[PDB]
Amino acid sequence: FQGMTEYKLVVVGAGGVGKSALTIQLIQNHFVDEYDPTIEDSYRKQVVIDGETCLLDILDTAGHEEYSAMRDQYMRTGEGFLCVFAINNTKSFEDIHHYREQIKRVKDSEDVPMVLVGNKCDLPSRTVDTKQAQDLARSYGIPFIETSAKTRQGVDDAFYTLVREIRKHK
Ligand SMILES: Nc1nc2c(ncn2[C@@H]2O[C@H](COP(=O)(O)OP(=O)(O)NP(=O)(O)O)[C@@H](O)[C@H]2O)c(=O)[nH]1
Ligand SMILES: COc1cccc(-c2ccc(Nc3ccc(C[NH+](C)C)cc3)cc2)c1
Ligand SMILES: [Mg+2]
């Protein structure tokens, strides 16, 4: 034993869905109200999940990004993916399929650890129904979690569930 197990997590999804808010809420217990678009940021947190101490290495991605070769590099290194949309933005939900395809393509695999995340569940302007999202997740064979970076609902659960998925995969 040389140190706690390490997991490489990538947070992906359309611009504005709250990928950064979720990550910052996890790491710093802080909600960011301001919208500062991200290019690429890396974070690290030690947690205990199901009695195993482990180290989450988290890559926060950009939503607004085209073809890049830098992009495909970290999808190759990443062991698990949080695919985030916002429950008040139907476009970000439809984009989920595109994110999953990019991942499946680069990892050259049908069975990649993933979790579907419906963020901003605190907002009253919901446009994507929970049942719809559960059905999408059921069809992909992956878990679905509703989160709010603001209230903190589901945040820990989302990351911990992803880790549990990576564990099952090996
Ligand atoms: N009400 C509410 N607002 C949220 C939530 N998550 C993020 N936001 C808000 O939505 C905006 C976008 O959040 P942000 O984390 O920057 O989104 P992002 O996916 O990281 N954007 P980008 O892809 O450009 O980096 C911020 O103003 C933030 O306050 C949430 O769960 N609830
Ligand atoms: C290539 O694809 C990946 C994919 C996903 C995550 C990672 C990853 C994330 C964070 C770290 N670690 C890290 C290093 C420095 C700091 C900054 N320190 C001040 C804490 C934070 C995290 C390392 C790798 C790499
Ligand atoms: Mg971001």
Whether 116 contacts 142, CB under 8 Å: yes
Nearest listed ligand to the Cα of residue 77: 2
Q: Residue 19: which CATH number?
A: 3.40.50.300
Surrounding ion ligand 3 within 5 Å at CB are 19-20, 38, 60
DSSP β-ladder status, 40-49 and 52-61: antiparallel
Determination technique for this PDB entry? X-ray
Q: How many domains in the chain?
A: 1
Does the beta carbon of 119 lie inside 6 Å of ligand 1? yes
Does the beta carbon of 124 lie inside 6 Å of ligand 1? no
Neighbours of 120 (CB within 10 A): 24
Does the beta carbon of 71 lie inside 6 Å of ligand 2? no
Whole-number Å distance between alpha carbons of 98 and 108: 15
Instruction: Look up the domain containing 22 and give its range.
Output: 1-170
Distance (Å) of CA 129 to CA 16, 25, 51, 104, 126: 19, 24, 34, 25, 7
